[PDB]
Structure 1
Amino acid sequence: FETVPVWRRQPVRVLSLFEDIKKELTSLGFLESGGQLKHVVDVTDTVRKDVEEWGPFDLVYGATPPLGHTCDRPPSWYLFQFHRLLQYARPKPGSPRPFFWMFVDNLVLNKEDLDVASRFLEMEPVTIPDVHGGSLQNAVRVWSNIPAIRSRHWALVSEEELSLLAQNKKWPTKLVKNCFLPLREYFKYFS
């Protein structure tokens, strides 16, 4: 998707699954105050027509509950449902257009759940840590095709240090908000 000139950039149309990143996207100038966001939490009864009738989406965001919140679901439910609804929203091959998707895990997915998430999203996850004082306080794993997200990786963080964090323990939206910034070359900035 080669970039868009500043004149013809339109407001982004986003589908936030499970968790709501409306407020985070406002503070980056992706949405204007007052609605281009559809946020659903229980997608159990969502069919392709519902995703189609809700206006064409440019960004499909999904994330599992925070690490502390004792979960409604099995962790794989948020991955499988995201994958299904993501297919419903992506443009038909006849009309290519800017389309992005992001799935984020806050160390809720089990070790076995990780391999199937990477096979269904066809990408190895990105480790976005929260480290202060030389010790790792929090982290998230995200899968997405947003242009600049893989170099955000921290190879210093390892799986043991991640699961050790998971056993010791709100959604740290602060770790994922900066990853949307490569998208302002495609959609309108609201000042």
Structure 2
Amino acid sequence: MFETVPVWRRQPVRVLSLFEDIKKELTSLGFLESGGQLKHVVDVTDTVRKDVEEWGPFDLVYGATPPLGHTCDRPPSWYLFQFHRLLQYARPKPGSPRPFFWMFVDNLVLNKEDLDVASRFLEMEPVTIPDVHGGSLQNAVRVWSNIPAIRSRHWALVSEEELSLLAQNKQSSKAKWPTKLVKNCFLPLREYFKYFS
């Protein structure tokens, strides 16, 4: 873990948002301002490590699969593998430690055998973030992250069959990204960076 940064020298986040973009949500939480401190890129097949150092440095690396019910160009594991690769490119070298956070989100797009590879390459098992209304499960996301309080938001009440049936129904319907579920996940970070009111 990283140590607390006092309020005077808290500097703005340098966010690397892969695939989807979270500029709107982040600036809704006061991490960005109107003016770009957030690099966004969707096709990283030709971007190499020197490109990440060029766009960097970065204090946060973010990636997320395409929405549920939106059949994608790429295979689902592609976003995961590319996020891992570019996260390795963006990690601070072990000589200079500094607060560095990352987060990958799945809108129930990765299948059963992709989730094992996910928990393997990300070294944690995902956090199930649901959207319940009237006692019924409307949407959900799985999250891998080292952001501090990311583990306490897990819903053990949501089983895997429930998630699979949700994904089946909402892909047979074929709805855009529900970023409301991951928005509160960034709040434990303002004690490390600046807040814009």
CA RMSD between the two structures? 0.4
Query: 1:109, CA displacement in angstroms?
Result: 0.2
Query: 1:34, CA displacement in angstroms?
Result: 1.1
Per the alignment, residue 149 of structure 1 pairs with: 150
Q: Distance in 2 between matches of 1:174 and 1:183?
A: 17
Q: Distance in 2 between matches of 1:72 and 1:62?
A: 16
1:29-52 deviations in Å (ceiling 9; x for gaps): 000111100000000001000001
Q: Distance in 2 between matches of 1:57 and 1:103?
A: 15
SS in 2 for 1:101: strand
SS in 1 for 2:62: strand
Identity %: 100
Query: 1:70, CA displacement in angstroms?
Result: 1.1
Q: Distance in 1 between matches of 2:62 and 2:71?
A: 21
Query: 1:82, CA displacement in angstroms?
Result: 0.2
Q: Distance in 2 between matches of 1:151 and 1:121?
A: 18
Alignment length, in residue pairs?
A: 190
Q: Distance in 1 between matches of 2:31 and 2:84?
A: 24
1:42-73 deviations in Å (ceiling 9; x for gaps): 00001000001112000000000000111111
SS in 2 for 1:4: coil
Q: Distance in 2 between matches of 1:120 and 1:181?
A: 25
Query: 1:74, CA displacement in angstroms?
Result: 0.2
SS in 1 for 2:103: strand
Per the alignment, residue 166 of structure 1 pairs with: 167
SS in 2 for 1:3: coil
**Unpaired stretches in structure 1, ≥5 consecutive residues:** none
How high is the TM-score relative to the length of structure 1? 0.99
Q: Distance in 2 between matches of 1:152 and 1:34?
A: 33
SS in 2 for 1:139: strand
8 Å CA contact 2:56–2:90 kept in 1: the answer is no
Q: Distance in 2 between matches of 1:33 and 1:180?
A: 19
1:1-24 deviations in Å (ceiling 9; x for gaps): 011111010000000000000000
Q: Distance in 1 between matches of 2:8 and 2:125?
A: 35
Q: Distance in 2 between matches of 1:118 and 1:25?
A: 26
Per the alignment, residue 49 of structure 2 pairs with: 48
**Unpaired stretches in structure 2, ≥5 consecutive residues:** 170-175
SS in 1 for 2:46: coil
8 Å CA contact 2:20–2:65 kept in 1: the answer is yes
Give runs of ≥4 in structure 1 deviating > 4 Å.
none
Q: Distance in 2 between matches of 1:33 and 1:93?
A: 34
